[PDB]
Amino acid sequence: GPHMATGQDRVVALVDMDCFFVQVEQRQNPHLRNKPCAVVQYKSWKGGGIIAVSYEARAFGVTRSMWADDAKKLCPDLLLAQVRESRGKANLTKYREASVEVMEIMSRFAVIERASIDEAYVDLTSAVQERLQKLQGQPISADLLPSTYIEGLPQGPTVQKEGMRKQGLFQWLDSLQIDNLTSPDLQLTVGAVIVEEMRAAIERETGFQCSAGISHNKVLAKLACGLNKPNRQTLVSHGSVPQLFSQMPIRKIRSLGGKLGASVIEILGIEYMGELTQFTESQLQSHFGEKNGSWLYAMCRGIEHDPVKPRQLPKTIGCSKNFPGKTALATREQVQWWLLQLAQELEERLTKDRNDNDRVATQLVVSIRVQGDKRLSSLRRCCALTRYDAHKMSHDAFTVIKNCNTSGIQTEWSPPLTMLFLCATKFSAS
DNA sequence: ATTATGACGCG
DNA sequence: TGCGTCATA
């Protein structure tokens, strides 16, 4: 009743760039614009591995993780842009720098949480309050929401997509109570107006298009964002949740796409997020733990409290290289050469980071994978990062892992290494 | 698929 | 103030 929290206290958006690495390459090379194209990493094995795909190429069935040779079978005219290679490895600097362009624009509107290279959460609660005070009970025009979908609408008593979008928006706006500054639906609507403005600024100032979700928390905002891609935004209201969740596979919700989500499905014998409402909080805690159980109990009702963290910069700076099949490092000299390449890239990125962001990493984390281990990581060890010097970091990394070598011969390495990973962490102000 | 980030548990 | 695992981009 009057004491039941509905999780409508915040306005949260998630902005996610459309096919991000592709847009970065299309900005740089106009010949790629408005074409089926993909970004590929390396070239020797099966034409290279695809890591990003334009919407035109997706129509042919091209996907991330596909080898380029196989993608060409589906889309013979597919254009390809290669990730830069430096010091023997893929180097992602262009995309990291493009990400900074977008994050800096978003930060003008509100505090953001960098969630990945191409997406950020925004807590718009305060910005919405401010905008509502300027509006002064003035209605919100559909013209202020030219790319917004209202999930669940139209409904009740045109066969084209834009027509449906407008119909739903009209129904939503007609029902809005602009009189009440505390109305959560109104708050979301104003949030959506702000997000249109943010998205326009991103496109004007960078050339890049994006999609966004607007809702009352991060999980719903992330879900919302994916409902209408690309180049569109979606408002998921609290009232839209029962219908939305009634046919929503559990795996679609952030954090439930893996083993936990599979366990929810198997243990409870359900398929859709909505079906979770039929269990008590204690029942859910009994299967999935105190924390997960409480989270699921609220989440299936559209309620989540995880804050948008005030963090625009990554907390770690890392680089890594796999050594597949035949290339597994079987000599000490090889292990040392690659550790040096990684350390040189790391030194370059750290030195730039220190100058830009007034901070210094204090810990170096070294991780390896050994041949035969199905685990993505076989071993992790750390040491002090006291100087931004590639030679010192590579030597320190070796020292930390050299004991992993079973080889009797001092020159050889066994068992061969299938991966090396160096990561700088534990930043302190400088 | 390879090269990344970030959270959480304490087999 | 370590390390392994999970989940995601």
Ligand SMILES: Nc1ncnc2c1ncn2[C@H]1C[C@H](O)[C@@H](COP(=O)(O)OP(=O)(O)OP(=O)(O)O)O1
């Ligand atoms: N598994 C991966 N390995 C390497 N790079 C990845 C991987 N997943 C994503 N990326 C990179 C390339 C992407 O352009 C960028 C952002 O990823 P993501 O948001 O998942 O898709 P996207 O931006 O390419 O398309 P979409 O329009 O569907 O968001 O990060």
Ligand SMILES: [Ca+2]
């Ligand atoms: Ca994206």
Ligand SMILES: [Mg+2]
């Ligand atoms: Mg993304």
